[PDB]
């Protein structure tokens, strides 16, 4: 299991490598055997979509007590947590972990 | 049937289905005799209290009744949390009532 947390896999999701194909600017009219360092400056843009299916383990506790849950707070604030501000920059308030429910040992 | 066999079992669990949660609850009750088996008539003058807003007339009965018209009769606090924390609504569907292992003393 990775020490920073997560799922350790022998064969994780493969790396996806992407490159703009070099387009030479224009060769000299007489032949030259050197490797054509002059190129047309360009960049690419696009859309990428990732779809992951996750299997869940539903909590099945017989505990009578109400449990601890992650919640937002109902107190007036300048900004909404996990939103954008007046500038338009999105920010995340605190690091949310996954351990809120309980189980017996 | 008979003295030596029980006419029911204890069953006070909760089962969460897809869109259905089935609550069962078993309790032990005691029933006294009320009114010495009589049908006394009662009033505000019967108990002596005098106020027109509080004046009443009615009947006391030798019968008892079963009330389970509260949510904590059917939900543990943990079940209530499991319900209110991820559900936009709920409503009762069907009711089953059992009365077993009666002993007159």
Q: What is the chain B residue with the closest CA to A64?
A: B78
Cα B83 to Cα B49: distance, rounded to the nearest angstrom: 44
3 state DSSP class of B21:
strand
Whether residue A10 lies within 8 A of chain B, CB to CB, comes out as no
Closest residue to A66, CB basis, from B13, B16, B78: B78
Resolution in Å, one decimal, please: 2.8
Asked if A65 reaches chain B (Cβ–Cβ under 8 Å), the answer is: yes
Q: Is A61 on the interface with B (CB under 8 A)?
A: yes
d(C-alpha A93, C-alpha B44), whole Å: 62
A46 vs A44: CA distance, rounded Å: 7
Residue of chain A with shortest Cα separation from B81:
A66
Residue of A nearest to B72 (CA): A64
Q: How far apart are CA B27 and CA B8, in angstroms?
A: 12
Say which of B13, B16, B77 has its CB closest to residue A66. Answer: B77
Which residues fall within 8 angstroms of residue B21, CB to CB, at 6 or more apart? B14, B15, B79, B83, B90
Interface check A24 vs B, CB under 8 A: no
Strands (E) located in B5-101:
14-16, 21-23, 41-43, 57-59
Separation between Cα atoms, residue B75 and residue B82, nearest integer Å = 10
* Cα distance between residue B42 and residue B61, in whole Å: 10
Contacts of A67 in chain B (CB under 8 A): 78, 81
DSSP B23-38: E-----------TTS-
Structural method = cryo-EM
Written as six digits, the tokens of B67 are 């009330």
Q: Can you read off the two tokens belonging to residue A16?
A: 């996806």
- In angstroms, what CA-CA distances link B93 with A97, B20, B85? 37, 9, 20
């Amino acid at each position: 299991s990775p020490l920073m947390g997560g799922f350790g896999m022998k064969h994780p999701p493969p790396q996806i490598l992407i490159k703009n194909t070099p387009v030479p600017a224009d060769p000299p009219t007489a032949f030259n055997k050197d490797k054509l360092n002059s190129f047309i400056t360009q960049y690419s843009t696009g859309q990428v979509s990732v779809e992951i299916e996750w299997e869940l383990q539903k909590e099945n506790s017989k505990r009578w007590n109400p449990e601890i849950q992650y919640t937002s707070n109902y107190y007036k604030s300048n900004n909404v947590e996990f939103a954008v501000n007046t500038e338009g920059v999105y920010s995340e308030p605190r690091p949310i972990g996954t351990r809120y429910l309980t189980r017996n040992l | 049937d008979g003295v030596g066999s029980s006419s029911g079992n204890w069953h006070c669990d909760s089962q969460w289905l897809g869109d259905r949660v089935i609550t069962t609850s078993t309790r032990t009750w005691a029933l006294p005799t009320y009114n010495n088996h009589l049908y006394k008539q009662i009033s505000n003058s019967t108990s002596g209290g005098s106020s027109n807003d509080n004046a009443y007339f009615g009947y006391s009965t030798p019968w008892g009744y079963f009330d389970f018209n509260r949510f904590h009769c059917h939900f543990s606090p943990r079940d209530w949390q499991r319900l209110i924390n991820n559900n936009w609504g709920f409503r009762p569907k069907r009711l089953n009532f059992k009365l077993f292992n009666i002993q007159v003393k």
